[PDB]
Structure 1
Amino acid sequence: SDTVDIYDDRGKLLESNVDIMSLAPTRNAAIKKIILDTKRSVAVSLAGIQGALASGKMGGKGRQILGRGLNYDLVGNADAIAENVKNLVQVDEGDDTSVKVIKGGKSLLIQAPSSRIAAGADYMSATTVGAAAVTQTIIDMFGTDMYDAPIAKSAVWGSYPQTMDLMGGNVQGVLSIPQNNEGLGFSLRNIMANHIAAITSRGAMNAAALSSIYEQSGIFEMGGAVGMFERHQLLGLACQGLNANNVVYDIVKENGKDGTIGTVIESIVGRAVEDGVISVDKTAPSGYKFYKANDVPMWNAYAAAGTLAATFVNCGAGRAAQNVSSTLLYFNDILEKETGLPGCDYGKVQGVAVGFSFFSHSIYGGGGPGVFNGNHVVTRHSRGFAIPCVCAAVALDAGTQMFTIESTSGLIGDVFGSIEEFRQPIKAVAG
């Protein structure tokens, strides 16, 4: 029964001696609220629907349906569309359904009820109910001829059902379609680094918390954390993302002004040795001290905490986002050469860091690191300990990339900005 202490962004204490088990995706009510709001929320851009209806650009990139322009003002009376869509989405009056309009009436934010999530086997019945409700609201407010109903439908639904995705419909959720998963239970780790940095307003360790929250929700969904492995993944959650015992912040404030990766390595190896976690087992003839692990889950928790601390130090010192692909790799490599131990996640974090670098230096770029989610084929490999680092560095960038946080901010960040469990995830963990 591990008893982790969790501290916040600024390093002050939140709740003393919480159980490791209570931070699980399956037990904590807070992370349940994050994943339910991720499941049900969907944002519809009425300005996009209006341009689709007038111009004829619906259902994909480059597609234009000519001659069927349906000239209509959607942004001008978006409040009326808002209460109509609240009427059609909802199961009963006064349920857990709220659609609210964005500034200027250019968008609205559909949140499907909890019952439309309970009554469906997967997560994205919210998308379909919201898209159909918006479509029927548009039909009811035109007075359109029924031979112009399909145009007003595919302006909202895109090229679905011909395409497996909606593909151009202005109804858009955060998670991808369940057919576009990588494996069994990876649908909840399909939130890229730009979105999850925009959600938390580019705070670093308030971002690495969120991606670790989503990533260990994905790990607990896939059956990859049962029995004693559940302790292993959950201790990695506690130490890397959620700031266990101020470790990942102490390394930063100790190695901020002149620290490097190597000073971080010396810092956490000193901490691991001083904590009784790692012992020396056979001093070699050259004075080398080979090391053994007294408790391997807690040692991998220190290796994860050190990996996030090292990417904090290296990326924030550089004020650049591309340094994860070096930092995770060479940090875990020099850690293994320093101790004679395995790195974080027994080489998997170092491997996926090599994948990060191969991905984001030469071919198939994926932005820089901002288009990194754990659902991708090159990022899925580690069991939850690299995408927190990536999103943490994306929060620390100073504007080196062009696909900035402001590019998808109106898409996702303002959508999830009113939710304090989304905005500041570390303190909104209680149970």
Structure 2
Amino acid sequence: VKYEDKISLYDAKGNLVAENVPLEAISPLYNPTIKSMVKNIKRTVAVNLAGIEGTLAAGKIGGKGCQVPGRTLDISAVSNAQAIADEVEKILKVSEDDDTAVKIINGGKQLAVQVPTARLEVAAEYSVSMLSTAMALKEALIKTFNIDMFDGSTVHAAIVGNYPQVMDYAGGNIASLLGAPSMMEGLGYALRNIPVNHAVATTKKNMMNAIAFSSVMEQTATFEMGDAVGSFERQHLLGLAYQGLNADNLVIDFIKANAKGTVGSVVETVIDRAIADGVIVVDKTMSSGFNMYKPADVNKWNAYAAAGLVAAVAVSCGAARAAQNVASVILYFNDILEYETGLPGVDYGRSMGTAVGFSFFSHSIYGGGGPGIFNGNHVVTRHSKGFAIPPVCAAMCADAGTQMFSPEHTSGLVGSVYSAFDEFREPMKYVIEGALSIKDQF
């Protein structure tokens, strides 16, 4: 309504879906699919029944390398998975017809539970889902196997690992996409605490879908943090539309134009497209002949640069088939673009700095690790407001297996549980559908 710029819509295969779609159609505040994803991500919990059985059988309660001799329970949770799921569903159900579901995953080896939305309406935050699921699991295990009154403590330690003493679920067998609120590095960072490996495993290593998932989460978080309000909203709307949903097919076009190219070729393609579309114009011609450029549309130029950054990351990490080039590509795409055009980087240097720290902590002794363990809540990658993580997800999708902390190593339970929902697995094709649904309401 207040934004007059339209965008096209292309799928992950580069085929046209619709034209003249208003920019607000993909907004988190309007798109039904983004609202549904945020609502479902708060109520979905992953349960490791096999992990519970193994922890109880060996007394592995406590956390890393911790055993309590004497507190050993022999139960058959995986065999009685259907009964346990039925009991948990009965406990968590609000009335009859709420959206309470406990599906069986991997032949009862895992559980995917969805607490009802009615239990979250009167909740201030998202922690109600995990606590309610933990209590339901404790009650179901106590009343299925007639566990002694003096062993409910062991059952609780098996389900959540240290929670009263450690404000987290570290040694437990229960998990969710979002981290604990005590792990947030800033206010409004709840949606930024999804690691790259979780997003890659949820989308089953699909590059475009992982980009869409990560970008949607990051921009919805920027809306939550209050960053994308007032005059800052259009910039983030365009960043989500172009870098994350390839609105004008920019990402696929750049990758196609640079199938056997380098980062510099991608930069040249981005500048050529920006000039052709009128986004940037020649400011002045210097004495040496350098053509300094100025943005005719600042936010559109930002979106074009972000799409080009994603394309450059894809090109380089597909040429190498290794996900360790992400930080260098993100750094030097901006570094060469700025001194080729005289224009600011993707996020006015905020993404380049994120890359300069990512290169620090991905190649040194001081912390960090593989690119898959980073997230928007991380102290190293929190600095770019939703413009640096989708490239990392794309690169980790392009990896061929050169990383030790791969999504399989880190996100096995979370990925397997959250891949069962079509909205999480293929966010691109459903966000496009949600935008098409409200196309005519603006």
* Residues in 2 aligned to 1:329 and 1:361: alpha-carbon distance in whole angstroms: 14
User: What letter matches 1:171 in structure 2?
Assistant: I
**Residue of structure 2 equivalent to 1:252:** 255
Could you list the per-position Cα deviations for residues 278-308 of structure 1 after superposition, in whole angstroms to 9, with x for gaps in the alignment? Answer: 1112101111111111111111111111111
Could you list the per-position Cα deviations for residues 11-70 of structure 1 after superposition, in whole angstroms to 9, with x for gaps in the alignment? Answer: 001222221112111211101111122111111111111122221111311221111212
Runs of 5+ unmatched residues, structure 1: none
* Residues in 2 aligned to 1:169 and 1:93: alpha-carbon distance in whole angstroms: 30
SS in 1 for 2:308: helix
User: What letter matches 1:339 in structure 2?
Assistant: T
Residue 94 of structure 1, CA deviation: 2.8
SS in 1 for 2:364: coil
Match of 2:281 among 267, 279, 288: 279
Could you list the per-position Cα deviations for residues 312-353 of structure 1 after superposition, in whole angstroms to 9, with x for gaps in the alignment? Answer: 111111111011111111000110001111011100011101
Match of 1:332 among 327, 331, 334: 334
User: What letter matches 1:139 in structure 2?
Assistant: I
1:198·1:408 contact (CA, 8 Å) conserved in 2?
A: no
Residue 408 of structure 1, CA deviation: 4.3
**What is the TM-score when the length of structure 2 is the normalising length?**
0.95
* Residues in 2 aligned to 1:147 and 1:202: alpha-carbon distance in whole angstroms: 45
**Residue of structure 1 equivalent to 2:394:** 392
**Residue of structure 1 equivalent to 2:344:** 342
**Residue of structure 1 equivalent to 2:206:** 203
* Residues in 2 aligned to 1:216 and 1:191: alpha-carbon distance in whole angstroms: 13
2:110·2:413 contact (CA, 8 Å) conserved in 1?
A: no
After TM superposition, the structure 1 = structure 2 runs for residues 78-117 of structure 1, keeping only pairs within 5 Å, are 78-117=81-120
CA gap of 1:57–1:124, structure 2 versus 1, over 3 A, is same
User: What letter matches 1:217 in structure 2?
Assistant: T
1:59·1:167 contact (CA, 8 Å) conserved in 2?
A: no
Residue 129 of structure 1, CA deviation: 0.2
* Residues in 2 aligned to 1:364 and 1:4: alpha-carbon distance in whole angstroms: 43
1:349·1:386 contact (CA, 8 Å) conserved in 2?
A: yes
Could you list the per-position Cα deviations for residues 378-430 of structure 1 after superposition, in whole angstroms to 9, with x for gaps in the alignment? Answer: 10100111000000000000111122333345312221223222222111112
* Residues in 2 aligned to 1:240 and 1:99: alpha-carbon distance in whole angstroms: 35
**Residue of structure 2 equivalent to 1:236:** 239
**Residue of structure 1 equivalent to 2:55:** 52
Residue 206 of structure 1, CA deviation: 1.6
* Residues in 2 aligned to 1:174 and 1:155: alpha-carbon distance in whole angstroms: 20
Match of 1:144 among 144, 147, 155: 147
After TM superposition, the structure 1 = structure 2 runs for residues 145-184 of structure 1, keeping only pairs within 5 Å, are 145-184=148-187
**Residue of structure 2 equivalent to 1:268:** 270
* Residues in 1 aligned to 2:61 and 2:358: alpha-carbon distance in whole angstroms: 35
**Residue of structure 2 equivalent to 1:221:** 224
1:53·1:155 contact (CA, 8 Å) conserved in 2?
A: yes
Name which of structure 1's ranges 62-71 and 317-326 shifts more when overlaid on structure 2.
Answer: 62-71
* Residues in 1 aligned to 2:44 and 2:415: alpha-carbon distance in whole angstroms: 13
* Residues in 1 aligned to 2:407 and 2:26: alpha-carbon distance in whole angstroms: 29
Count of equivalent residues: 430
Could you list the per-position Cα deviations for residues 108-152 of structure 1 after superposition, in whole angstroms to 9, with x for gaps in the alignment? Answer: 111111111111000121000000000011111222332222112
Residue 364 of structure 1, CA deviation: 4.2
- Displacement over 4 Å in runs of 4+: none
* Residues in 1 aligned to 2:18 and 2:129: alpha-carbon distance in whole angstroms: 35
* Residues in 2 aligned to 1:13 and 1:415: alpha-carbon distance in whole angstroms: 32
**Residue of structure 2 equivalent to 1:413:** 415
* Residues in 2 aligned to 1:294 and 1:106: alpha-carbon distance in whole angstroms: 56
Runs of 5+ unmatched residues, structure 2: none
* Residues in 1 aligned to 2:151 and 2:408: alpha-carbon distance in whole angstroms: 37
Could you list the per-position Cα deviations for residues 255-275 of structure 1 after superposition, in whole angstroms to 9, with x for gaps in the alignment? Answer: 102x11111111111111111
* Residues in 2 aligned to 1:30 and 1:89: alpha-carbon distance in whole angstroms: 25
SS in 2 for 1:205: helix
Q: Does 1:23 align with 2:26?
A: yes
SS in 2 for 1:326: helix
Residue 168 of structure 1, CA deviation: 1.2
* Residues in 2 aligned to 1:218 and 1:72: alpha-carbon distance in whole angstroms: 41
User: What letter matches 1:237 in structure 2?
Assistant: L
2:138·2:152 contact (CA, 8 Å) conserved in 1?
A: no
Name which of structure 1's ranges 353-362 and 1-10 shifts more when overlaid on structure 2.
Answer: 1-10
**Residue of structure 2 equivalent to 1:424:** 426
Q: Does 1:76 align with 2:94?
A: no
**Residue of structure 2 equivalent to 1:10:** 13
Identity %: 56
User: What letter matches 1:377 in structure 2?
Assistant: V
2:335·2:345 contact (CA, 8 Å) conserved in 1?
A: yes
Name which of structure 1's ranges 389-398 and 292-301 shifts more when overlaid on structure 2.
Answer: 292-301
Could you list the per-position Cα deviations for residues 350-374 of structure 1 after superposition, in whole angstroms to 9, with x for gaps in the alignment? Answer: 1101111101011245432111211
* Residues in 2 aligned to 1:408 and 1:62: alpha-carbon distance in whole angstroms: 18
Residue 187 of structure 1, CA deviation: 0.8
* Residues in 2 aligned to 1:138 and 1:394: alpha-carbon distance in whole angstroms: 38
Residue 165 of structure 1, CA deviation: 0.7
Name which of structure 1's ranges 349-358 and 163-172 shifts more when overlaid on structure 2.
Answer: 163-172
